[PDB]
Write a protein that binds this ligand. Sequence first.
Ligand SMILES: C/C=C/C/C=C(\C)[C@H](O)CC/C(C)=C/C=C(C)/C(O)=C1/C(=O)C=C([C@H](C)CC/C=C/NC(=O)OC)OC1=O
Lengths: 17, 49, 1111
Amino acid sequence: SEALRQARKDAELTASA
Amino acid sequence: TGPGNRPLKSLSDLLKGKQGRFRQNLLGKRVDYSGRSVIVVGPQLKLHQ
Amino acid sequence: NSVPGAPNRVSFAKLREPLEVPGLLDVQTDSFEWLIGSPRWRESAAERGDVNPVGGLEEVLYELSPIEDFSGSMSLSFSDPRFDDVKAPVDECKDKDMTYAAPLFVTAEFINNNTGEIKSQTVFMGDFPMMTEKGTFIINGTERVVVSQLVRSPGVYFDETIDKSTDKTLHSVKVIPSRGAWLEFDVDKRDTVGVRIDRKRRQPVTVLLKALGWTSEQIVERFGFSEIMRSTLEKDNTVGTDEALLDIYRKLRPGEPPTKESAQTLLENLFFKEKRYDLARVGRYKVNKKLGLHVGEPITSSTLTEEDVVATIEYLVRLHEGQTTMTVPGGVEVPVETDDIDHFGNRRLRTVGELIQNQIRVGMSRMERVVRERMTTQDVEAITPQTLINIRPVVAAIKEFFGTSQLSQFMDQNNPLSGLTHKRRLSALGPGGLSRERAGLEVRDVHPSHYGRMCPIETPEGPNIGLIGSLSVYARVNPFGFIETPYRKVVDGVVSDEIVYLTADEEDRHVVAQANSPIDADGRFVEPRVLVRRKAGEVEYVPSSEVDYMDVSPRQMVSVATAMIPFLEHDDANRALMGANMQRQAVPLVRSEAPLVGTGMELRAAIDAGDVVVAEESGVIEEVSADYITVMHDNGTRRTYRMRKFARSNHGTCANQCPIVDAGDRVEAGQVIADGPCTDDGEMALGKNLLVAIMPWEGHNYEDAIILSNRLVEEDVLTSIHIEEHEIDARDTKLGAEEITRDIPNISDEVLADLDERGIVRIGAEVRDGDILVGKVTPKGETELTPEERLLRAIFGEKAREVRDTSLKVPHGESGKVIGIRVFSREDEDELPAGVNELVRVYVAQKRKISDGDKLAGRHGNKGVIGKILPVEDMPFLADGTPVDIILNTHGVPRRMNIGQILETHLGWCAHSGWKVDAAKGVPDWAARLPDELLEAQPNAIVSTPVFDGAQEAELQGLLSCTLPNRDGDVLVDADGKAMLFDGRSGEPFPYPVTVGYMYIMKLHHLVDDKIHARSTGPYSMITQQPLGGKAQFGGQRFGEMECWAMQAYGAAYTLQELLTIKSDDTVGRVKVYEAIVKGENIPEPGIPESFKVLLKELQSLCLNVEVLSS
Ligand SMILES: C/C=C/C/C=C(\C)[C@H](O)CC/C(C)=C/C=C(C)/C(O)=C1/C(=O)C=C([C@H](C)CC/C=C/NC(=O)OC)OC1=O
């Protein structure tokens, strides 16, 4: 349930640049 | 990119000191007018010699 | 014994080992031949099962064939990787700089799937390098050495790091395959599943099972005792397979539309389609072996199975369940326990042929992905695989591997010993291997599985300790990259005599006591309570019934070099390793005497050393020479053997080979015929045997300071040969073609004396630094002369000669004759690089006497620089007037814990002296169990001791009691190893007896001249303004951060300013100061630094308003 911390991070790595 | 699997170097990277977040060894320009050698004792010699 | 030319060295073997030494070079020979698949290997592997003898190349064929289009309309295949003979002999390849290789032919075949027709060709795959018979390789004449790299294999890896914040063991697994994806079966903090897989962040097992075609019924059925399983299946919160499939698919490709067929058509490709997810065959083997799954069948199908994953989960849960061992259906129970990355059972060994096959695979990958490219673009029913083939990328990869690789390294041939030592080397750093800092310190440690496999002593003492070692002597390799080790299995209180090549894992199953055990002459033993190594690597007095394996022998945990230091078990590992790494740094003397004392290693070492020529066939000699020998094979046939004389090593040391026999002699096969450099009478020889005392004398032996008598110098006992090679090219410029000739620009005549007629100097001429080597010249171009120079020409009638003077002069500090001239010319059809037409290489030698400052060291790590070369007369000496050889300082001994050198010294004095123990009243008790014929000794007879099987101090004392006089009634040494001596300076006896004796020592490859260097002014930079660093050129010494901050501490500022300005950057100021010195005038003022202004411009150009204000 607390594994979602990567979700906030994973979103920003991808669409980055 | 180029050839040779190895990153780039902006102007930012030409900074001599350029210590970011870590204070590595310094390693300046290796001056002139010296000589190196192994060392040996001078037991006959005076102190100042 | 068991050696034909074995010179008689008596040893102190109190034991007897069943097995003798193995074939040390087999480590490379066998990998290489398997990669070959040579019939040698064919019968070899067949010796121990190996139903399918497959060469690495054969493996590559089967893993590559067939070759087919995605349409599947047409099919390509290979067969018969067949080697052709080498294109040239090894000597010729080396000399002419052609890399010793051989062609490659393949029975490749293409067929069109549409109709089906064979396209069989025997394709030249390319010329392929061939290992030396010394297990090395020659690239372009250069001689390298590949290294075997340590890696923990891919495998099912277990651990339960307790969440101390939760106080719960967190069992986990990371099954890392080759060319595959990762996966975790984690014991979460909750009673749940850590089913994060392929670097995903988290999964429930239920999603896998229904994704794997499993109902919750099927799971609880398969997993009834599975508590976290039942819990998660209650919290699975998703039902139906395809629901799990779609959830997996979306979470795997988030940012992607889910499709139903990708349920099976992605995962099966991810983990079961064995074309992009394939741990090694050895990986599959490790899997089944850890799990007893594929119990009785050969390894294949690197793709996985739900069988595998389910047994995985069962063992994992049971491990986080409280368990000891679980037998999977179809598998024997595996003991429930964790895994180790450090322990050898995971840490495999990528061998030479291994790495080669890796390169082959990576090349063939690119090649096939272009064949399939053309596979369609190629015209149909008109192509041939010849039309389909490109060997360019493969050969490119081959070349870039042999060259351009930290695993393909130059064979350090400073002597046969260190040459061997370079081989049999172990390192885990490299491509795939960890880099330096990324590895934790613990990998450097000495895990108890290392015992008997990797000698814990030999390793570089720099900042790579623990990163690189070598093999234990009697070790041997798994076909699967493991250490298969022999062992003496004991049965029924009786050691058998069946050697047992064991890995480390099975070792943990068992019970092994020590070779030094009171065996009752029969395998039977003496005492019940016996030392023994535990599965935890631990020792106890086992009752003498329980062991099933005994040590094969002592010193099974030693390295090669480590195998060559007597008394080794008496001194600290520190100085031990020091002397160890140093001993490879020995330098071949010209006389090459053997030490009085040694081990059993000194002969086997050379017989694997190779450079000593070995009798191929038993026979009678035919005729010798200083350069070769004609040999009479026993029936008709004969042969010569070209001595290598004055061959330049990779380090300037000579490489002569002198024959050691006579033309009327007769010898046997596998026998010594001519010593190499560091070889004497067949066995090793790394120095001389010298009588030394240990007093502190005059302070000259201060803090490792090492004194020397002139006697050795004038006796040439320390005499090195050095071979410096110089080379220069014949390029061609826009100004024209470079020129080489006696024709020169402005130059003396005498300086043009010892040249030949056509430039280059004459053979045999003495030379000195700066002297001309080769007269070469090129046009310089045209510029307006100075009016002054024009005036000098006018008054002197001297022409322009615009061609610039570009000759070859010897660099600094060099002299000695020039042996041979190596000359290459494009006009001669000498193949040369482009923009070149003529090449020449020169060979100068200089018979370097020993000189003060050079570094010597015994066989104990006990080392030091040469203190001072004292004359012979001014020397403490015997009562027989025999002067001492050298003197060492006692004060370095205790704090270094190196008594073994003292032991060696006493032993050497005894050896030189000779004895005859009076066994008149039976035997003196210490000599009781001592081997016979040691009861006397001819003076200066050679002897040896096994490392762990050495003489006792009481034995040595009883010896020293028996020390028969040299010539007269002459007991020069007390029973305490000392004696009274005379100062050749004073005239008096010293007040006390003094320790003395014969020691063997070496000479290191750190001569004074190699290090001595100074400079005032030389060739300034190109980027910066700065006269070149590097002792190859002048170079010099860098006054940086440590003694700046320092000078500030002193307070003296002007010197620092001068250094950092007029010795650093002031372009004008440099010549200014030079002028001022030349004129004898006060120093100019320090100008502005240059790099300062450079940084200033940089800061400017960074769009930065910059400026100084003077006021
Ligand atoms: C124009 C300056 C702009 C700001 C400075 C920048 C961006 C530099 O990034 C840091 C300063 C620096 C480093 C510049 C190095 C230069 C110009 C260069 O090429 C060297 C050099 O590499 C080393 C030295 C000396 C040997 C350094 C001695 C330091 C002593 N420090 C001390 O005495 O302790 C209190 O001088 C140079 O001109």
